[PDB]
Design a protein around this ligand. Structure first.
Ligand SMILES: Nc1nc2c(ncn2[C@@H]2O[C@H](COP(=O)(O)OP(=O)(O)OP(=O)(O)O)[C@@H](O)[C@H]2O)c(=O)[nH]1
Ligand SMILES: Nc1ncnc2c1ncn2[C@@H]1O[C@H](COP(=O)(O)OP(=O)(O)CP(=O)(O)O)[C@@H](O)[C@H]1O
Ligand SMILES: Nc1nc2c(ncn2[C@@H]2O[C@H](COP(=O)(O)OP(=O)(O)O)[C@@H](O)[C@H]2O)c(=O)[nH]1
Ligand SMILES: [Ca+2]
Ligand SMILES: [Ca+2]
Ligand SMILES: [Ca+2]
Ligand SMILES: [Mg+2]
Ligand SMILES: [Mg+2]
Ligand SMILES: [Mg+2]
Lengths: 425, 349, 54, 438
């Protein structure tokens, strides 16, 4: 009984979190009404990690939905699995955050944060042994970015010895809502560097490129992008949701993936990614090749530009575990120049017999690569292009912020980049 | 794509092997500290054998046999020959040798003096040579023992071949270098090409003070000898010329008069230590190139001088031998996508 | 090659063959180390909370 | 009679312990419910098997064992498994959250809060002993509990049981069945703080067991169940002398006297043969000479290394099955004329031999096949130092960059303990080299 408390904040955070609970609910045999109808005991072996058990053998996700406007969460409540969430776990305001990190972190968000923590506390008080928390959010908006990192700071204050984990969607000008997204992402990255133990970097550009070039989607939508994020979230959490010995909990995963506390930003990867030749069987060599291919990663960073500090790989489905080891060792031995040599045996492989829905087998990739600095470099460059002219700052100074706070967040993200560069050589 | 690391930058032999391996386009060189290698071109001293063969999914091979030093050390070789029943103390192809520790430090001082006094009393030739891993040739035991005490390392005193076979014209001494390769299956391959490192000075049995005509080392002949390169280029005669000499002068062949004994000696040495160094049932595999040095007396009897565990090659023979090392030692374990240049010395494992 | 000290019983036997002859911290200190480590954890957490208070 | 208490720490210790006690019961004729029909003394007795089993008035034979894990999932298998009736709840101790593969977390943060409870449960077992010999401690090197909590327990056991011997069965980390990158850190940290408290330690490298299972048992991808069944056979062969009538290694003190002439060098190499697959059509039964000669093949050593290039300090041959002394000495003599066996000059060149007529017991449905005779050789070779070399090298690679050190300092450990532990290992490697090399 190692419970995880889930939190989803803002438009992006709630839309992706909704699909996540939809995908894993199907994998665990939970229907939209929280009733279990699976056929395998592996489905319920670790069901309490993400689900609470109510009267009548009902399973209720341990999820808290937060937003500063009602719209998106109204859609979730009307969505497919909307009825499965605890009604009291909907916490929302009416003002909105106007894609403004300051509104979510300092003004509008501050007015609502205490009520969110009341629900978090309630969910924690019922946990036999709470592992930690996982937050889904974007960094380019106001609520998920600004109030999301505010929640993290206060959750850390009240639960300082629990693990804080995030799925963070990074903005990209190719899939942009407002020009201030680099401002909001730089302010958030500052928070994440200090207050999270593990952060999966999901770049909206990578998701777009995959939908367009690989999946052959002419006009990708936010829905299409969220399918990739759903599948990736389900893959990286397999080790927590099913019986296993590798990275089986949040703290052990951090111990194996984070050699230095600030360098906890991961590149996730998923295979297969097939366009609609979708029925063809996928061999273990193919799964391994694609899973390590840059085109199958979702941070928009070329791994061959840096080195892997650590790697976690999860193979799902009924397959030759002997052939999995061989192919994993083949990838390391055929490209050992992209793995740091001062961390012996830094590639760990886990297997799970239950494959995702509609797939004979798949592989999920988790990399702590120094190439992630390219993602923070893009943000920093977009940040500086506007900040050198102080463009659009009035949205933030109007909420009480000072320019110095922008300079500090910028410097810290540039330090992070430099820190990655030193371990790449 | 096979991977190898280089840990001995001063090895001319494996520098060429590494150069050849890369030329195949099927081998990639890794940093000397990267553990994910198929082949280690290891260092000469303190090679970390204990870290080999613990890499899941890599068949690991190294170019040195752990424990071969027993054969390639002046004092170790003497102890191995006297104590191994296969070689026995009565071995007929190794000069009467003794291990002598300096008095400032078992030791065969008295055993040597006993044999020495017997020769002195029997009017026999009593010239010995002292050396260590700085050489002194003398007929008085007092000078031999006093010379070793002035040093601080173990030495060996063995009989000096007072009747060496002298080439003509020149009346000059020489020694024969034979290159031997033992692969992971412990096959013993003798390179078809040897070299005679000859002295360009007439042999003089009445003066062991000038060591230029008695020591056939290439560095000594090229540094202290004044007839270097007079008879053969670089004081190096090869088997073709040397064989023709044996026919013209001695009406015999190199194979019958000398090579049979050389092959017998090579076999006896390596087979003796096979149980101690074989990697047959080991988690990693070994091969090694050996340099055997021989002496030929005027009776066409062959004597073993020493065994070198990290030999160099004759400039004219680097290309052929280094390629041969890749064919039978490296590609035999890691195949790529004749008329062998070796002579397999068959034996019972 | 000599056999010595042969001992035989219903369930087995044992012997010896010779081929050749030859030629703490107190309870008090453990508690201090455990408390010393616990104090450093408390100090580190208090610094984190002080940081979050600012 | 003198009792032995077995302590199993962490997942590796607990799961290996479950496999050994399963085997002990089959060897002594004890049923899963604890009943022993052959035992004609109901509720008591000082027979050789009583060193490991106590007896209740109702005739139940209860292992003298304590299971400890900082997380309940593994020990919950024991509570509801086949032998759930062997142990009473006081013997199975579990926490709520584990040490996260962090030595400092098991030794300091979590260990400090549960150490006194474990000692209390051990004290209960000790109070049933009229003459306690000591303890056998099973644990891994790489786990946070197996490494961190074990060293804390060994320190306290030396305080609370000063005159008692303590032996270890330690699992050496192997990447092929490991998912923790910091296991070299934990292994070296636990060896440093445990070295002075262990009189004799049998190291088992998972790499060796993994390859024996693939090569000899034809298991393409061995599981922990495969590995543990084989390890329990080796463990059984080592402890058989304490549980059966005999005259060799009859008490824990004799293990040190026979295998450890120098206190710090207390890691004997174990070699076992034959290991035959139960799925084989049918095997040509191996002789005394063939199983004995197999003891000098690296392929059946619990730790892969080359004894030809070290020196022996002691050697015990533990035979089980149809073996008479005459055939042992004939095999030894033939192995001396073919094998490189170099002893240290200050030790005699000899072998202590123990024979048990009962052949190895095989778990029904297991992987191993029934054989007419088996042998486990315990040799104290300096060649096992190769395992310290491998381990210290990996340690050095990560510590040079301080990789993962913050996880340990964050649990209250001082960084200097890293260098203190590493310097102790450097001295250990130097001790081996002084004894084995000329
Ligand atoms: N031979 C064998 N090795 C095991 C077994 N279980 C775990 N290991 C090894 O032990 C090491 C991991 O340590 P664990 O014993 O699982 O960790 P722990 O003692 O439970 O401590 P925690 O970190 O708190 O979980 C790895 O090297 C595993 O390969 C087992 O059942 N048999
Ligand atoms: N017992 C002996 N009788 C006659 N000559 C001897 C001898 N021992 C050595 N020599 C002479 O000394 C020369 C080299 O001696 P040795 O080989 O022992 O030194 P070394 O090992 O430093 C040279 P290398 O390793 O290249 O063979 C030989 O060419 C030989 O002519
Ligand atoms: N992948 C994905 N990204 C989104 C989605 N909705 C918004 N975003 C991204 O999130 C950023 C806008 O933040 P948003 O969540 O809408 O603001 P918030 O409601 O204040 O947190 C922009 O970078 C968008 O590209 C979505 O459904 N999926
Ligand atoms: Ca307001
Ligand atoms: Ca009884
Ligand atoms: Ca003690
Ligand atoms: Mg929006
Ligand atoms: Mg030499
Ligand atoms: Mg555990």
């Amino acid at each position: 009984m190692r419970e995880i408390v889930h939190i989803q904040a803002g438009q992006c955070g709630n839309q992706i979190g909704a699909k996540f609970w939809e995908v894993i609910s199907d994998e665990h045999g939970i229907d939209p009404t929280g009733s279990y109808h699976g056929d395998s005991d592996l489905q319920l072996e670790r069901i309490n990690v993400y689900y609470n058990e109510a009267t009548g053998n009902k399973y209720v996700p341990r999820a808290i939905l937060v937003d500063l406007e009602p719209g998106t969460m109204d859609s979730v409540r009307s969505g497919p699995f909307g009825q499965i969430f605890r009604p009291d776990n909907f916490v929302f305001g009416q003002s909105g955050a106007g894609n403004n990190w300051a509104k979510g972190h300092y003004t509008e968000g501050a007015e609502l944060v205490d009520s969110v923590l009341d629900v978090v506390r309630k969910e924690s008080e019922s946990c036999d042994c709470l592992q930690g928390f996982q937050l889904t959010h974007s960094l380019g908006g106001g609520t998920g970015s600004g109030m999301g990192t505010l929640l993290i700071s206060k959750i850390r204050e009240e639960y300082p010895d629990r693990i804080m984990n995030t799925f963070s969607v990074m903005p990209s000008p190719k899939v942009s809502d407002t020009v201030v997204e680099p401002y909001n992402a730089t302010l958030s990255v500052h928070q994440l560097v200090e207050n999270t133990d593990e952060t999966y970097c999901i770049d909206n550009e990578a998701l777009y490129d995959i939908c367009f070039r690989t999946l052959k989607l002419t006009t990708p939508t936010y829905g299409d992008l969220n399918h990739l994020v759903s599948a990736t979230m389900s893959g990286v959490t397999t080790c927590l949701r099913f019986p296993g010995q590798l990275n089986a909990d949040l703290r052990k995963l951090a111990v194996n993936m984070v050699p230095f506390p600030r360098l906890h930003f991961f590149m996730p990867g998923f295979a297969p990614l097939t366009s609609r030749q979708q029925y063809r069987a996928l061999t273990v060599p193919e799964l391994t090749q694609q899973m390590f291919d840059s085109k199958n990663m979702m941070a928009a960073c070329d791994p061959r530009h840096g080195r892997y500090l650590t790697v976690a790989a999860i193979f799902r489905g009924r397959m030759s575990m002997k052939e999995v080891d061989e192919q994993m060792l083949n990838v390391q031995n055929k490209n050992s120049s992209y793995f740091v040599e001062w961390i012996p045996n830094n590639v760990k492989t886990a297997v799970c017999d239950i494959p995702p829905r509609g797939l004979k087998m798949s592989a999920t990739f988790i990399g702590n690569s120094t190439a992630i600095q390219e993602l923070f470099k893009r943000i920093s460059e977009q940040f500086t292009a506007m900040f050198r002219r102080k463009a659009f700052l009035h949205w933030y100074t109007g909420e009480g912020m000072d320019e110095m706070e922008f300079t500090e967040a910028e410097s810290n993200m540039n330090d992070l980049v430099s820190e990655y560069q030193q371990y790449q050589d | 794509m096979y991977t190898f690391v280089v840990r001995d930058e001063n090895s001319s032999v494996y520098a060429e092997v590494s150069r050849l391996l890369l030329a195949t386009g099927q081998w990639k060189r890794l940093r000397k500290d990267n553990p994910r290698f198929n082949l280690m071109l290891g260092e000469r001293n303190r090679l970390p054998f204990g870290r080999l063969g613990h890499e899941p999914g890599l068949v690991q091979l190294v170019n040195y046999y752990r424990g071969a030093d027993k054969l390639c050390r002046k004092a170790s070789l003497v102890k191995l020959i006297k104590t191994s029943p296969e070689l026995s103390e009565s071995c007929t192809w190794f000069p009467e040798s003794y291990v002598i520790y300096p008095t400032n430090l078992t030791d065969e001082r008295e055993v040597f003096l006993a044999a020495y006094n017997r020769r002195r009393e029997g009017r026999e030739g009593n010239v010995w040579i002292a050396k260590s891993s700085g050489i002194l040739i003398s007929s008085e035991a007092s000078e031999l023992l006093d010379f070793i005490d002035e040093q601080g390392q173990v030495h060996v005193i063995q009989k000096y071949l007072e009747k060496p076979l002298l080439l003509e014209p020149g009346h000059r001494k020489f020694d024969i270098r034979s290159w031997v390769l033992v692969d992971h299956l412990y096959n013993i391959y003798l390179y078809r090409e040897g070299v005679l490192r000859t002295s360009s000075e007439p042999y003089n049995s009445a003066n062991f003070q000038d060591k230029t005509c008695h020591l056939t080392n290439h560095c000594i002949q090229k540094e202290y000898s004044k007839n270097y390169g007079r008879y053969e280029e670089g004081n190096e005669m090869f088997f073709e010329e040397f064989n023709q000499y044996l026919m013209d002068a001695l009406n015999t062949t190199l194979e019958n008069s000398i090579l049979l004994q050389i092959k017998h000696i090579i076999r006896s040495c390596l087979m003796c230590i096979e149980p101690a160094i074989s990697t047959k049932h080991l988690h990693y595999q070994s091969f090694q190139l050996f340099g055997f040095d021989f002496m030929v007396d005027e009776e066409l009897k062959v004597w073993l001088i020493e065994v070198n565990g990290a030999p160099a090659c004759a400039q004219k023979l680097y290309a052929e031998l280094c390629q041969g090392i890749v064919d039978v030692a490296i590609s035999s374990v890691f195949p790529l996508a004749p008329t062998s240049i070796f002579i397999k010395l068959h034996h019972h494992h | 090659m000599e056999v010595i000290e042969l001992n035989k019983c219903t369930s087995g036997q044992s012997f010896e063959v010779i081929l050749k002859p030859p030629s703490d911290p107190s309870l008090e200190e453990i508690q201090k180390k455990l408390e010393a480590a616990e104090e450093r954890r408390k100090y580190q957490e208090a610094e984190l909370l002080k940081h979050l208070a600012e | 009679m003198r009792e032995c208490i077995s302590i199993h720490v962490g997942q590796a210790g607990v799961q290996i312990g479950n496999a050994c006690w399963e085997l002990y019961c089959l060897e002594h004729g004890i049923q899963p419910d604890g009943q022993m029909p052959s035992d004609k003394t109901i509720g008591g007795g000082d027979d050789s098997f009583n060193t490991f089993f106590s007896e209740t008035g109702a005739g139940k034979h209860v292992p003298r064992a304590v299971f400890v894990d900082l997380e309940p999932t593994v020990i919950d298998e024991v509570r509801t498994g086949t032998y759930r009736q062997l142990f009473h709840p006081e013997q199975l101790i579990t926490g709520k959250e584990d040490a996260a593969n962090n030595y400092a977390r098991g030794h300091y943060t979590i260990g400090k809060e549960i150490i006194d409870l474990v000692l209390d449960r051990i004290r209960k077992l000790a109070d049933q002993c009229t003459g306690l010999q000591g303890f056998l401690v099973f644990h891994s090197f790489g786990g946070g509990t197996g490494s961190g909590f074990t060293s804390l327990l060994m320190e306290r056991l030396s305080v609370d049981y000063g005159k008692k011997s303590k032996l270890e069965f330690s699992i050496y980390p192997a990447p092929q069945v490991s998912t923790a990158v910091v296991e070299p850190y934990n292994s070296i940290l636990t060896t440093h703080t445990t070295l002075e408290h262990s009189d004799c330690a049998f190291m088992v490298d998972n790499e060796a067991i993994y390859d024996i299972c693939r090569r000899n048992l034809d298991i393409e991808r061995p599981t922990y169940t495969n590995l543990n069944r084989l390890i329990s056979q080796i463990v059984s062969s080592i402890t058989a002398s304490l549980r059966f009538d005999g005259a060799l290694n009859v008490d824990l003190t004799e293990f040190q006297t026979n295998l450890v002439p120098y206190p710090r060098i207390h890691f004997p190499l174990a070699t076992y043969a034959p290991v035959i697959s139960a799925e084989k059509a049918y095997h040509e039964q191996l002789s005394v000479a063939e199983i004995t000669n197999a003891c000098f093949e690296p392929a059946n050593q619990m730790v892969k290394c080359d004894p030809r290039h070290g020196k022996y300090m002691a050697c015990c041959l533990l035979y089980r099955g149809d073996v008479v002394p005459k055939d042992v000495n004939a095999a030894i003599a033939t192995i001396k004329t073919k094998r490189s066996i170099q002893f240290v000059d200050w030790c005699p060149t000899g072998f202590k031999v123990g024979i048990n007529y009962q052949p190895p017991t095989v778990v029904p449905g297991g992987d191993l096949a029934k054989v007419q005779r088996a042998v486990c050789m315990l040799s104290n070779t300096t060649a096992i130092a190769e395992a310290w070399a491998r381990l210290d090298h990996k340690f050095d690679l990560m510590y040079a960059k301080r990789a993962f050190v913050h996880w340990y300092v964050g649990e209250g450990m001082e960084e200097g303990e890293f260098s203190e532990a590493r310097e102790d290992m450097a001295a250990l490697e130097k001790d081996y080299e002084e004894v084995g090399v000329d």
